[PDB]
Each structure stands twice: as C-alpha cells, then as structure tokens.
Amino acid sequence: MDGLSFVDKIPDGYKNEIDQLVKKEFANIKADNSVSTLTNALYTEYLKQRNNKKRRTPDFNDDDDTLFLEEYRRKYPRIDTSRYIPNESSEVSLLGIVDSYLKHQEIVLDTLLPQTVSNQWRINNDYIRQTCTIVEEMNIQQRKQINDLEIYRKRL
Amino acid sequence: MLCAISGKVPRRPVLSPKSRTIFEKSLLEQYVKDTGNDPITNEPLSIEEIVESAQQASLTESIPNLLTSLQNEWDAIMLENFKLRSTLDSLTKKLSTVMYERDAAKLVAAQLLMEKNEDSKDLPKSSQ
Amino acid sequence: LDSLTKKLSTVMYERDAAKLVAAQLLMEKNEDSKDLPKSSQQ
Amino acid sequence: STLCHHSLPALIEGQRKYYADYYAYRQEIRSLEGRRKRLQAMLNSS
C-alpha cells in the first residue's frame, strides 16, 4: 500500500517498468412505458420524427383542404400578433429581470468551487507532513542499516 | 435554486424536513407515492411532511413552439439519455479493468514482499 | 454514473499509488543481489 | 474524494511500513550486539 508521493522525488521509466510487471500479472489472470422504446429507437437510428411542415407553404386557389389551411394561418397570425404585443409592452424589463437571476445562479457555483478547492488543498496539506515525518524515519532506518552492514564485516 | 431530482429550476419548490434539500413539487410528490421515503437520504418521508418567482423571456420569434421548439426538446432528451446509457456502460467496463489491474498489483507486492526481506535476511546471514 | 466514477477514481489513483510500491521494491531487491553477489564472491 | 480516500489508506500503510523496518532494525542490532563479544574475547586469551 505505502508509496510516498511528496517525498519520492520517481521517473517515467519506472512507471513504464512497473506497468510491464503489472501487465504480466494481468496476462496471467486475464423502468418506463412505451416512451422508452421509441426514445431509444430514435436515438439509436439517429432520426427525429417529422413534424407538421404544412402551415408555412400552403397555396391560394386550392380547394376545401387549402380553405382550412388558409383559415389556420389567419388565427395563428392573429395569435402571433397578440403574442408579440404582450412581449413588447414589458419589452426589455422582463428580459433584464431574468438576466439578474442568472447572475445570482452563477456566483453560487463558483463559491462551491472555492469550498472544494480549500478542502482539497487542506487534505493534501495534511498528507504532506505525514510524508515528511516518515521519510525521515526511513532515512534514519537506512543509515542504521548501512552501519550494521559494515560493522558486522569489520568485526569478522 | 435547482431541484434535486430532474436538474430543473423549480416553479413551486418544496423542502423536506428530514433532509434539507429543495425539490420541485411534482417530482417529490411522485417519489413519495412510488416509495414513501426521501430520495437522497432514504429516510421516512410523506406528502404531509413536505414544506412548500422565475422569469423566462419568451423569444421574439415565439408555429415554432409546436414544430421547431418541441422537436428539439424531444431530440435533446432522446440523444442525451442514449449517450448517458453509453457512458454508464463504459464506466462498468473500465471498472473491471481497474479492479483486475489492482489485484494484479497486489500479487506483485505480495510476491516482492517475500523476495525483498529474504534478500535482506541473506545479507544478515552472510556476515556469519 | 457518478457513484461508479468514485470507484473508478479511487481505484486509478490507488492503482498508480500501489504501482509506485513496486518501483521502489524492485530497486531495493536489485540492490540486495549485487551486494550479496559481490560479497559472496570475495 | 480522491485526496480524502488517499489520506485514509496511506495513513494506515505507514505504521506497517515503519513497524516492518523497526523489526528489521531490531534484528540488525543483534548481529552488531554479538559480533562485539567475540572481539572482546580476543583480549581474554591474551
């Protein structure tokens, strides 16, 4: 488990080396209704279902069919012209009121970006001290190790 | 400011008293009837336990609401969840490659733990 | 999706962390060989 | 959540790292502790 990240100042060759040894040990081991059916089929096939491309074109001196199609264009154009009246009445006040809401929504996210930033650096900060604590202790151990190694020889 | 189920910006937000989290009324009311518990914390919660303005500027070119806008909404719902199902499938596959490579490393360490200390032991014995 | 990503992230981090155990271990094992070999020779 | 996890698994691995080397050191001390005595007994024969 133990591998000191901050203390071990470990080349790319060692990653490539260890990857090969890990690789060799891997060589050894080796709820909705009908809605979901049509939605998954639409996405898989990459084709959206065609809508009513009729109101836009039409034609004068048609028949009973275009008499309907004509009368459709009138009522929707009157609804359109009424739908543009209540927008222009308020105008830009309704738009800029929503623009202000979006600024309150945005700043909230970036506050959380900082809260995460601080606690993430704070955890790493605690790790750092641990790394330097033990890395010294390991240094102490190795020095003592080398002392015996030659001490035992010089006695014999 | 958002709902904690769909990812909406709620029109009638309602907060639960067991876990302080704001949901849109329709979506929290649906969960309680499906299974009577809080979706996030899995704690007992009922419809009576719940405790209850946003402006969108309708575009200048607002026919399109029936044809173009509604079409795009069910395209965007369709191709996202399909792509999201694709993302979930790969995470499980990439999970299996993670755990296998992990266990492969465990065996290396276990193999090397026997190797190292016995090599060190042999140096201690050599002196004699 | 995100709950599996936590497992993915914790693994990949811990994998390459555990990978550095080997790199260290291998070089020490190697050091034990030449040391003993050069000593046992003489 | 990574650095949170990395903290918890690392903090336990260190004691195990050290304790191994600690016991590794104890054995090394014994060889040191005896090798002297044989040298010390060279003066007894003299």
UniProtKB/Swiss-Prot annotation, chain A:
Domain of life: Eukaryota
Entry GO terms, CC: Prp19 complex; U2-type catalytic step 1 spliceosome
Subcellular localization, as worded in the UniProt entry: Nucleus
Record text on subunit structure and interactions: Belongs to the NTC complex (or PRP19-associated complex), composed of at least CEF1, CLF1, ISY1, NTC20, SNT309, SYF1, SYF2, and PRP19.
GO BP: mRNA splicing, via spliceosome
Keyword Nucleus in annotation: yes
Protein name: Pre-mRNA-splicing factor SNT309
Note: Present with 721 molecules/cell in log phase SD medium.
Disulfide bonds: none
Organism ancestry: Eukaryota, Fungi, Dikarya, Ascomycota, Saccharomycotina
Job description of the protein: Involved in pre-mRNA splicing by stabilizing the NTC (or PRP19-associated complex). As a component of the NTC complex, associates to the spliceosome to mediate conformational rearrangement or to stabilize the structure of the spliceosome after U4 snRNA dissociation, which leads to spliceosome maturation.
Keywords: mRNA processing, mRNA splicing, Nucleus, Spliceosome
Swiss-Prot record, chain C:
Signal peptide start and end residues: none
Location(s) in or outside the cell: Nucleus
Quaternary structure and partners: Homotetramer. Component of the NTC complex (or PRP19-associated complex), composed of at least CEF1, CLF1, ISY1, NTC20, SNT309, SYF1, SYF2, and PRP19.
Functional description taken from the UniProt entry: Probable ubiquitin-protein ligase involved in pre-mRNA splicing. Acts as a central component of the NTC complex (or PRP19-associated complex) that associates to the spliceosome to mediate conformational rearrangement or to stabilize the structure of the spliceosome after U4 snRNA dissociation, which leads to spliceosome maturation. It is also probably involved in DNA repair.
Homology family: Belongs to the WD repeat PRP19 family.
UniProt miscellaneous comment: Present with 11700 molecules/cell in log phase SD medium. The tetramer is an elongated particle consisting of four globular WD40 domains held together by a central stalk.
Protein name: Pre-mRNA-processing factor 19
Species of origin: Saccharomyces cerevisiae (strain ATCC 204508 / S288c) (Baker's yeast)
Gene: PRP19
UniProtKB/Swiss-Prot annotation, chain D:
Location in the cell: Cytoplasm; Nucleus
Function: Involved in pre-mRNA splicing and cell cycle control. Required for the binding of the NTC complex (or PRP19-associated complex) components to the spliceosome to mediate conformational rearrangement or to stabilize the structure of the spliceosome after U4 snRNA dissociation, which leads to spliceosome maturation. Its absence leads to an arrest of the cell cycle, possibly due to the inefficient splicing of TUB1.
Family: Belongs to the CEF1 family.
Miscellaneous notes: Present with 784 molecules/cell in log phase SD medium.
Oligomeric and partner information: Belongs to the NTC complex (or PRP19-associated complex), composed of at least CEF1, CLF1, ISY1, NTC20, SNT309, SYF1, SYF2, and PRP19.
Name of this protein: Pre-mRNA-splicing factor CEF1
Species of provenance: Saccharomyces cerevisiae (strain ATCC 204508 / S288c) (Baker's yeast)
Lineage of the organism: Eukaryota, Fungi, Dikarya, Ascomycota, Saccharomycotina
Annotated gene: CEF1
Residues of the full protein shown: 542 to 587 of 590
